[model samples]
Target: VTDAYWQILFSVLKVTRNLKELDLSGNSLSHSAVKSLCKTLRRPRCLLETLRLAGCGLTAEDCKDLAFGLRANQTLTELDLSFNVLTDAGAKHLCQRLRQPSCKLQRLQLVSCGLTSDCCQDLASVLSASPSLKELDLQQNNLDDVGVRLLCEGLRHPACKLIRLGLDQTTLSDEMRQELRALEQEKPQLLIFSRRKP
Candidate 1:
């Protein structure tokens, strides 16, 4: 949809009190369009829980708006941002929001986004701090041994109750796999998928 269409949708969303899930995946939303949507997301009356913006050409500026919106909203639980270009900068903004005490986000998907080991440190902080988070999907990113090792720091935290972590298609080594296996014994509820299933 065009920016004008998004503006119209945002206008409609302002009155939409029962909106629970919004899926705009594969839509090439511009920064302004996403910002417009974030306005609706920030509404206190908004009941949105799941938001899927996969492949939406998202940028750091757009992520800033999303982070700001999420800061005010408390109902959002799942956010699917797969296949976007949200690099370390954008991820940093979202991670800050995730650390907020009021943030109720439970499932976060960053599959195929331009994330690296630098982003993992912030994610680890989120894991160690956020008690509501349950699932994190980082598949197809450039996270390597350093990233996995850093992530393990949070996984070892007693406050971290992450149930599932998707590391498939990442640059993890065999040694890191063994390390993750040992970590799993400490947190048996944690399911770490380092490789894709056939």
Candidate 2:
């Protein structure tokens, strides 16, 4: 559907007090559409829990607005931003909200979002600070060994309580794979799932 249709739908959903989950996946939502929906989401009474925006045409500008809306949001637990072009810059902005104590996000999916090692450090910070985050999916991104290794630092931290980490279809090297296996032994509670590229 077009952004205008989604915008009208969002407006309708805003006043529906029973609404908890919103899925707009496979819709090519533009920046303006996302911004308009985010305004409704920012309302103090909105109790949205799960949001799926997979395959939406989002950019850093859209992410900035989303970050603003999510900062004060409390009820959202799962967010799927897969199949977008939210590069390192956009990811970093979203990670900032994840780091906030008030943010109650738990599951975040960023599959094929054009991420790389550049954003791992920020995500690591989110892992260390956000107490509610439990699952993170980073499959099909451009993350290499360096990014995974950097992310391990936060995963090893005392405050990190992540349960599931998805890393399939990445560019990890053999040495990095070995390193991750060792880390897995150290933190048995944190499940690391990886399928290296052939």
Q: Write the per-residue lDDT of candidate 1 for residues 1-198, one digit (tens) a residue.
A: 689777877788786778889999998998778877887887779899899999989987788899998888878899999899899899999989897667789999998899999998999999998868899999889888988899999989998868999886335688897888899887999988745642
How many Å off is the CA of 192 in candidate 2?
A: 1.5
Candidate 1 residues lying further than 4 Å off, grouped into runs, are none
Task: For each candidate in turn, give its C-alpha RMSD to the true structure in angstroms.
Answer: 1.5, 2.1
Candidate 1 residue-wise lDDT at 20: 89
**lDDT of model 2 at residue 191?**
84
Model 2 Cα displacement at 94 (Å)? 0.8
Model 1: ten consecutive residues of lowest lDDT: 189-198
Among these predicted structures, which one has the highest TM-score? 1
Q: 94-167 in candidate 2: lDDT tens per residue?
A: 99888877878889998889999999999999988887999998988878887988898888898886988988
Q: Given candidate 1, what's the lDDT at residue 182?
A: 92
Candidate 2, after superposition: displacement of residue 2 in Å?
2.3
Q: Please give the CA lDDT of all the candidate structures.
A: 0.86, 0.85
